[PDB]
């Protein structure tokens, strides 16, 4: 199940559905643009839980570690999906098939234009590298499995070893996919380093987005509900 060709096919079959949403009838305001983006995020979070349960070994971790990994990565995983949907469309963010925002539309919401420019620049670096679909599947699974999991004290020890074995198997799978290209050994090491250095850019953008959303919530610009509200209250 963890051998490279079987693991990559399992990740391919686990991909979540595209969630559909459209623009409002009236011109956007700061409040109505925040309402459309947060309604989409809440529904994608529900499907994200079903995706994580499909990754081999994940439901064999402690329930406590399952919850802690999703709390630590959910905004990063929403942004990685958006970047892959937008990779062939310079100057646009493809939130859904009927919600395609031009860069300049971020001028509608205070503080969001900087975050759109971060997302668009990291999308442009994956376009320049010619990121392949099977490389994307491995890097998105590494985002889930790679957070700090500094020791905490639970009322109830193999769950950490189980996590390292799973993260090692996904890393081996990405090295196997790169080796199909047949480029030089130096070029394979350089491509691996280039893809993994972009993980810090996805964490940077997710930090700025989490601050922005918590401030829009506190100031009553947008109301938030159910799963999205719970993940924010817990942060």
């Amino acid at each position: 199940a963890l051998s490279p060709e079987q693991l990559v096919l399992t990740l391919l079959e686990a991909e979540p559905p595209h969630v559909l949403i459209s623009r409002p009838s009236a011109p956007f305001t700061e409040a109505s643009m925040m309402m459309s983006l947060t309604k989409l995020a809440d529904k994608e979070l529900v499907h994200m839980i079903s995706w994580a349960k499909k990754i081999p070994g994940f439901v064999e971790l402690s329930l406590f570690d399952q919850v802690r990994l999703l709390e630590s990565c959910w905004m990063e995983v929403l942004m990685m999906g958006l970047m892959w949907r937008s990779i062939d469309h310079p100057g646009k963010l493809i939130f859904a098939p009927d919600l395609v925002l031009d860069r300049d539309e971020g001028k509608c919401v205070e503080g969001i234009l900087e975050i759109f420019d971060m997302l668009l620049a990291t999308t442009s670096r994956f376009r320049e590298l010619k990121l392949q679909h099977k490389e994307y599947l491995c890097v998105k699974a590494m985002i889930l499995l790679n957070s700090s999991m500094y020791p905490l004290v639970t009322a109830t020890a193999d769950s950490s070893r189980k996590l390292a074995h799973l993260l090692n198997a996904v890393t081996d799978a990405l090295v196997w996919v790169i080796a199909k290209s047949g480029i030089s050994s130096q070029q394979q090491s350089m491509r691996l380093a280039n893809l993994l250095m972009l993980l810090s850019h996805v964490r940077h953008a997710s930090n700025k987005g989490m601050e922005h959303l918590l401030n829009m919530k506190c100031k009553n610009v947008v109301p938030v509900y159910d799963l999205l509200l719970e993940m924010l209250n817990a942060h």
Partner: peptide, 10 residues
């Protein structure tokens, strides 16, 4: 606290 996520995990 993690009230609704537990529910979807099981």
């Amino acid at each position: 606290r993690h009230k609704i996520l537990h529910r979807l995990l099981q």
